[PDB]
Amino acid sequence: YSAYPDSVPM
Amino acid sequence: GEVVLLDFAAAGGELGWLTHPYGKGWDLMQNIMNDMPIYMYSVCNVMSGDQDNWLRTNWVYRGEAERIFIELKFTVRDCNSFPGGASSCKETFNLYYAESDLDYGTNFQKRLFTKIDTIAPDEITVSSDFEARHVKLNVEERSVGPLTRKGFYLAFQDIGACVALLSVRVYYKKAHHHH
């Protein structure tokens, strides 16, 4: 599961 | 009359914070769906049940600051969004700090940190709002001091929540003067 929508690693 | 010492969101993820354990705990992410890029540290290990994930800032020189004000902006997803996570999922995280005269670099020792508070969301983000990209941004502020050493760190402890930390702003108030 993800904490925040449309988040991508940096 | 405020002087900003640390501003995560304005730094564009270039501040080089430290994660422990490195990998599989807090992760640096960006979201570029909006006008302004969004940067964040986030974690969401809500099923495991034995989480102890730490995030530490770079070292901040205190200068003239005595009382520092710490402003956090963050989202927390409803634990009911995750089936079977009744016992493993949490909805809070913990804020810590440490004062020091030198920079410890990559040596993160949580034993040097003092808890400031448990940070809890006034608004949790439920699944329908998450899927529609309507997250609920919470704001919580705490202060500590008087500081007495050359510098300080903040740290964030995740114990099994689904949390995104989007803003960390630390400032102090300049000394009041009689015009």
Swiss-Prot record, chain B:
Disulfide links within the chain: 44-162, 79-89
Superkingdom of origin: Eukaryota
- Mediates interaction with CLDN4: region residues: 2-174
Q: Give compartment(s).
A: Cell membrane; Cell projection, Ruffle membrane; Cell projection, Lamellipodium membrane; Cell junction, Focal adhesion
Provide the free-text tissue specificity comment from this protein's UniProt record: Expressed in brain and glioma tissue and glioma cell lines (at protein level). Expressed most highly in tissues that contain a high proportion of epithelial cells, e.g. skin, intestine, lung, and ovary.
* All copies of domain Eph LBD, residue ranges: 2-174
Describe how it is modified after translation. Autophosphorylates. Phosphorylated on tyrosine upon binding and activation by EFNA1. These phosphorylated residues are critical for recruitment of VAV2 and VAV3 and PI3-kinase p85 subunit which transduce downstream signaling to activate RAC1 GTPase and cell migration. Ubiquitinated by CHIP/STUB1. Ubiquitination is regulated by the HSP90 chaperone and regulates the receptor stability and activity through proteasomal degradation. ANKS1A prevents ubiquitination and degradation.
- Record's disease association: Cataract 6, multiple types: An opacification of the crystalline lens of the eye that frequently results in visual impairment or blindness. Opacities vary in morphology, are often confined to a portion of the lens, and may be static or progressive. CTRCT6 includes posterior polar and age-related cortical cataracts, among others. Posterior polar cataract is a subcapsular opacity, usually disk-shaped, located at the back of the lens. Age-related cortical cataract is a developmental punctate opacity restricted to the cortex.
- Job description of the protein: Receptor tyrosine kinase which binds promiscuously membrane-bound ephrin-A family ligands residing on adjacent cells, leading to contact-dependent bidirectional signaling into neighboring cells. The signaling pathway downstream of the receptor is referred to as forward signaling while the signaling pathway downstream of the ephrin ligand is referred to as reverse signaling. Activated by the ligand ephrin-A1/EFNA1 regulates migration, integrin-mediated adhesion, proliferation and differentiation of cells.
Quaternary structure, per UniProt, is: Homodimer. Interacts with SLA. Interacts (phosphorylated form) with VAV2, VAV3 and PI3-kinase p85 subunit (PIK3R1, PIK3R2 or PIK3R3); critical for the EFNA1-induced activation of RAC1 which stimulates cell migration. Interacts with INPPL1; regulates activated EPHA2 endocytosis and degradation. Interacts (inactivated form) with PTK2/FAK1 and interacts (EFNA1 ligand-activated form) with PTPN11; regulates integrin-mediated adhesion. Interacts with ARHGEF16, DOCK4 and ELMO2; mediates ligand-independent activation of RAC1 which stimulates cell migration.
Kindly provide the name given to this protein in its UniProt entry.
Ephrin type-A receptor 2
Q: Specify first residue, last residue and whole-protein length for the fragment.
A: 28 to 200 of 976
